[PDB]
Design a protein around this ligand. Structure first.
Ligand code: MG
Ligand code: MG
Ligand code: MG
Ligand code: MG
Ligand code: MG
Ligand code: MG
Ligand code: MG
Ligand code: MG
Ligand code: MG
Ligand code: MG
Ligand code: MG
Ligand code: MG
Ligand code: MG
Ligand code: MG
Ligand code: MG
Ligand code: MG
Ligand code: MG
Ligand code: MG
Ligand code: ZN
Lengths: 232, 60, 43, 104, 129, 155, 86
RNA sequence: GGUACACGAAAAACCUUACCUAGACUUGACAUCCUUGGCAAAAUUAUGGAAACAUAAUGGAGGUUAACCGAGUGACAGGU
RNA sequence: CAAACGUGCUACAAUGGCCAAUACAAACAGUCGCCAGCUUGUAAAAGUGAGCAAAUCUGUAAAGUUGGUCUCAGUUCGGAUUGAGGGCUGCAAUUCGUCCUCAUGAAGUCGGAAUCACUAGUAAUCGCGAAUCAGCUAUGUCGCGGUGAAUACGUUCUCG
RNA sequence: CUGCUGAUAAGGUCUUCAAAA
């Protein structure tokens, strides 16, 4: 049957919030809730070739701070910091010139075990007419070789352009979805194929969190150094 | 007809009671949360994505 | 033997006076100020 | 010596609890490192808001889930602070989730 | 040498003060005659149940403070408070009180209403045709 | 298909006459969860019994319930057409419960004035083996005696 | 129902038209959509064409119809006879 | 059918509104790409008006065009 | 709108109707708001006008207890429908808002074949709050507390 | 421990593929 969202079930217990701010009134709460959505959607739908794993937003009465974790931040940086100013102006237009922007790019360590970029690669391969069995097999084998626990990939839709929708699942390793202690990262993406839309959902297991607390700690960004700038 | 209705909602009317609250992300008119300015079906998505700070699932 | 008339005519006089006395006093609000979230007063 | 601020009533509130405890710990540590008599970091009842949302897109109003948002609240009143404590308080950098309602 | 007891029931606290006296117990609830505080619907015997079978000839002066609940909940709270204060005087009553189980919190509280249900456990009418 | 026997809650002794049956019949005449109202009804009826019979109300009540209290129960068991009944001996607890239930049901139907007097007169009438609960007990007893043959087969 | 201090209500475009057509001798039907306007004493003697929703039904006001709403003397839906289902 | 019927709809007098009648509009109420200037859009007061919209007014925050205000312009926007 | 079904509210009543005095909650919400007190009014409410950005101020607890009256009747039950006078919101209340007062007083006296929910603070019952909301016969939805039961011998039968 | 217990319009998806990594 239907299952609750893996991220939503674990939020507020073993996962911190992607946007951390306290608005003044109900009128401002909607504007701030929509502007952050616009910024995140921008960073995800465009500038996709940089493998942006996640973007967090942190706002005060008047100051906006953006933390963009990316696997290949060279594409965000551009040639001698060219596209950086373009995305800065895009964000400033999105929120407002009256505020102070503190954009900060962060190179994410051990990218392979991140469901967002795994799903994005899956969707890109699907859209590029790559055969599905080979695509999922190579993604699963590279994810496992990255040194993580089980990964479950569900790819549904008009499969290979067929007129009857199917679904194909590959679980390889233990994926306890009912357990709350487990560190399960879940992402979902849409491959826009010439025959319609394909939905790819990737669950990845990254061990068990044996330290009680609302995170306040990096999650698989720490194995190598996670120090990139563009801030003040 | 949805784009015209969204634009008309943003535009101020000539009477005060003419004004209604639509969702800001989507354009749904009914079942809009004035605390968040977002309809129920987009509030669920934002809460499951972690966008709204402090909105955790309730156990009572 | 009034046959309605007088009372409703007085009501109509009040209504016509209101219509002729309409003033564009359009507004939207009530209490003002005291809208902030405070801080360390300089951080 | 001067005071210039009698009965500084700091009020803290946040959607998160543990961050609030940590911020209160840092505040009390600094204010005891300076010569100020803290009344005490007491807690106040937490205002909990519950929103009920139908899961389904179209029908089945019976199947509906719930969400909560808690505004944890703490109180802390300082008797006499003086510049010697105010200047040190200027450099606290309270995290964004915490909210101050200083009342002087 | 006074004794203090704290009972609770159905979200209704009680603070019972037992004072040694030999001029009739003169039970008193929240500075008011119990016959006037309670509906006097013989619920008085409910709170006297642990103070009847053992003794009240010891003429304990009773100082009761109750804030919350209805009246049956308040009576249960002061019963538990009287028992718990009695545990501070000649603990030999502890065995006899435990025997008939007047020294355990009742633990019964009102359940929370559930969505899709007309109450804690009631369900809507079901039609098949 | 349950294979579990239900627990039993305490009956509680009555705090006036120290007779559990008084509390049981209070709970039986309970309606809308009004313990005070039920207790008032019972105690007013007992005072009217004092005023009329000039005897002990608890003794009169016991004499009424013991006389109304049945012996046999007929359990419906359908096989092919209609139902053939089965006489079975009842436990004492269910015996008392049925007696009290019949007493209350036939008390809340009599033609008289306030339910106080209604139930009081019903009790005094059942104390002398002449009443409506008496007729009910007689009917079930006669039906069981008629269908004594099928007592051997129960299920 | 309607408050006292507020009084009655007319759109005042109907009122201006009524005043003009009353000062003019050769009156003709006044085509109005304002069903919310109440029939003022000065309205008496004129004939109005109220928008029932589809067409303009003609109503001749009298010294008696004074007080009610202008569209109250015209309908909006019509039902006259059912048909047997079976 | 169970698994629809105080369900979508956690609010239909106007709006909502997607329906009917009628009065009006056409790269359009909204958006991008291009050749091109910004020395506006609002809001409100008059007359015609059922109101849309028209003819005249204060010609407006600003920042030299940033956003937006335009002309030309065909790809097109738009569709509950 | 000739009709039919589903889900609910109100009743057919002395375990009650009306009147007076009066005790005991939890949770939640609030600066175009919550509105204390006072004056006016038979009342909805109006005016004045503090307090509260809230464990501080506001949102009357009702069933329950006592007393008075009705005395088993289509009634001091029941409130539908209907006429009139007013209040509030709103440009605007006729189609199509709700509230108050006055007046009228349908059916209905426990509901056929047949069915529903429930295993303790549960059913039953009494109030309070919030969401969407200028306003709303939401009697709906989501929550909170007060009083508070009866029964389970057993799987022969019935549905899954 | 043997009551009674009858019927259900027509045509239809759904495996593309291992060549291989
Ligand atoms: Mg659309
Ligand atoms: Mg509205
Ligand atoms: Mg209900
Ligand atoms: Mg049925
Ligand atoms: Mg409409
Ligand atoms: Mg200029
Ligand atoms: Mg220029
Ligand atoms: Mg009475
Ligand atoms: Mg106080
Ligand atoms: Mg008052
Ligand atoms: Mg009474
Ligand atoms: Mg009749
Ligand atoms: Mg009546
Ligand atoms: Mg009306
Ligand atoms: Mg009768
Ligand atoms: Mg069970
Ligand atoms: Mg047969
Ligand atoms: Mg045949
Ligand atoms: Zn939405």
């Amino acid at each position: 049957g239907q299952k609750v969202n893996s991220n939503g079930l674990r939020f507020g217990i073993n996962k911190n919030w992607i946007s951390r701010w306290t608005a003044n009134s109900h009128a401002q709460t909607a504007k701030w809730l929509i502007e952050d959505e616009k910024i995140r959607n921008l960073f995800f739908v465009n500038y996709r070739n940089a493998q942006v794993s996640n973007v967090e937003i942190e706002r005060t009465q008047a100051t906006v701070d953006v933390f963009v974790y990316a696997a290949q931040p060279a594409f965000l940086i551009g040639s001698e910091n060219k596209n950086i100013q373009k995305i800065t102006k895009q964000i400033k237009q999105i929120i407002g010139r009256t505020t102070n922007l503190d954009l900060t790019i962060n190179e994410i360590g051990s990218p392979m075990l991140s469901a967002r970029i795994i799903a994005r690669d899956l969707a890109n391969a699907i859209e590029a007419r790559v055969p599905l069995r080979t695509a999922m097999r190579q993604s699963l084998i590279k994810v496992l070789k990255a040194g993580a626990n089980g990964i479950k990939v569900l790819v549904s839709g008009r499969l290979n352009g067929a007129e009857i929708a199917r679904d194909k699942m590959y679980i390889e390793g233990n994926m306890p979805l009912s357990t709350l202690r487990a560190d399960i990262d879940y992402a979902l993406e849409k491959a826009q194929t010439t025959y319609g839309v394909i939905g790819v959902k990737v669950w990845i297991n990254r061990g068990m969190i044996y330290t009680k607390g609302l995170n306040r700690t990096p999650a698989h960004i720490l194995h190598p150094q996670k120090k990139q700038p563009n801030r003040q | 007809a949805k784009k015209s209705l969204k634009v008309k909602q943003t535009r101020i009317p000539k009477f005060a009671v003419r004004a209604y609250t639509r969702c800001q992300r989507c354009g749904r008119a009914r079942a809009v949360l004035s605390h968040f300015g977002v309809c129920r079906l987009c509030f669920r998505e934002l809460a499951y994505a972690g966008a709204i700070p402090g909105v955790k699932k309730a156990s009572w | 033997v009034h046959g309605r008339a007088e009372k409703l005519s007085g009501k109509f006089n009040a209504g016509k006076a209101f219509l002729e006395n309409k003033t564009p006093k359009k507004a939207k609000g009530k209490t003002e100020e005291y809208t902030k979230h405070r801080s360390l007063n300089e951080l | 010596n001067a005071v210039k601020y009698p009965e500084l009533k700091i009020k803290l509130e946040s959607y998160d609890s543990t961050l609030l405890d940590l911020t209160t710990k840092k505040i009390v540590e600094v204010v005891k490192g300076v010569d100020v008599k803290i009344k005490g970091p007491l807690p106040l009842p937490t205002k909990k808001e519950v929103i009920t949302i139908i899961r389904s897109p179209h029908v089945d109003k019976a199947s509906r889930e719930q969400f909560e948002k808690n505004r944890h609240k703490r109180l802390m009143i300082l008797v006499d602070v003086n510049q010697g404590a105010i200047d040190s308080l200027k450099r606290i950098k309270i995290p964004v989730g915490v909210t101050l309602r200083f009342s002087k | 040498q006074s004794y203090y007891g704290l009972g609770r029931r159905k979200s209704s606290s009680a603070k019972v003060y037992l004072t040694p006296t030999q001029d009739k117990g003169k039970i008193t609830v929240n500075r008011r005659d119990p016959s006037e505080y309670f509906p006097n619907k013989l619920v008085i015997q409910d709170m006297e149940q642990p103070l009847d079978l053992t003794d009240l000839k010891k003429n304990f002066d009773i100082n009761v403070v109750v804030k919350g609940g209805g009246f049956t909940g308040q009576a249960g709270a002061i019963r538990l408070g009287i028992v718990r204060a009695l545990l501070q005087f000649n603990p030999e009553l502890k065995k006899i009180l435990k025997s008939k189980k007047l020294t355990t919190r009742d633990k019964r509280v009102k359940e929370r209403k559930k969505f899709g249900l007309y109450g804690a456990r009631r369900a809507p009418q079901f039609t098949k045709r | 298909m349950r294979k579990n026997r239900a627990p039993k809650r305490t009956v509680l002794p009555d705090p006036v006459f120290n007779n559990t049956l008084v509390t049981r019949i209070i709970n039986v005449i309970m309606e809308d969860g009004k313990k005070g109202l039920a207790q008032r009804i019972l105690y007013g009826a007992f005072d009217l019994i004092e005023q009329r019979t000039k005897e002990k109300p608890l003794t009169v009540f016991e004499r009424a319930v013991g006389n109304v209290m049945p012996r046999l129960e007929l359990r419906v068991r359908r096989i092919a057409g209609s139902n053939y009944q089965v006489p079975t001996e009842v436990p004492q607890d269910r015996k008392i419960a049925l007696a009290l239930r019949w007493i209350a049901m036939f008390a809340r139907k009599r033609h008289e004035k306030t339910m106080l007097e209604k139930i009081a007169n019903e009790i005094i009438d059942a104390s002398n083996n002449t009443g409506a609960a008496i007729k009910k007990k007689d009917d079930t007893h006669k039906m069981a005696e008629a269908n004594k043959a099928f007592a051997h087969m129960r299920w | 129902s309607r408050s006292a201090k507020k009084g009655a209500f007319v759109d005042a475009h109907l009122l201006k038209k009524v005043i003009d057509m009353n000062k003019q001798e050769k009156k003709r039907p006044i085509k109005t959509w304002s069903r919310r306007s109440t029939i003022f004493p000065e309205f008496v003697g004129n004939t109005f064409a109220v928008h029932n929703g589809k067409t303009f039904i003609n109503v001749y006001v009298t010294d008696d119809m004074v007080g009610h709403k202008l569209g109250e003397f015209s309908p909006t839906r019509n039902f006259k006879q059912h048909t047997a289902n079976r």
